[PDB]
Amino acid sequence: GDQRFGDLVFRQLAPNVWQHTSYLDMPGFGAVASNGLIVRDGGRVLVVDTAWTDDQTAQILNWIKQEINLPVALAVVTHAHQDKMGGMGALHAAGIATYANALSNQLAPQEGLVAAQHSLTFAANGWVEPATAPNFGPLKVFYPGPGHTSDNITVGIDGTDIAFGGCLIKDSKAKSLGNLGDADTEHYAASARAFGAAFPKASMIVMSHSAPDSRAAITHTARMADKLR
Ligand SMILES: [Zn+2]
Ligand SMILES: [Zn+2]
Question: Binding of Zn(2+) 2: at which residues (predicted)?
Fold first, then answer.
């Protein structure tokens, strides 16, 4: 189900949902895939995460023009690392409203990234305060606690069985938790579990660096994270 468009890959996950994938050479780990989402909600399109770069992110927008041909209303990005926010400039230049966790926006500049235009804030129970996520449509945003990074957020898609863990969640056969440079090692396992608990109906777990997996990905990630304490 993998449709190729330039150097990116687009896979349809549900009637109105596609996964976007872009690649970055990291001498040392090969050409590393990073995944986000594209969601059509009526007459507009919503994006979760940029690609690694502005040029790749512009190509996402070109694919949207070709295959969907509706305006992109907004993007939400799930933490301040290059794989998730490297293409913010391309979104802004295209006039697309952007949203991120407030903490992501605070950290973005010192990370060499462009902050989103708008900040999300979260209730005590982890769910986004809805007034900070206007026009999010079926996107349901949850802060599970610090894990892969202190600012990591997660997104469910109402009307589907899909939940997106971003870089918090690794697949059920992953050998490690990947980049732990900015991780909260004490809290990671609990945060991974909290993501699962927030989206109990989700059977397709989408994540940054592997194809979509079952809920076992969540359990496996949390077991690996337990080893960090
Ligand atoms: Zn990251
Ligand atoms: Zn990542």
Answer: 83, 167, 209
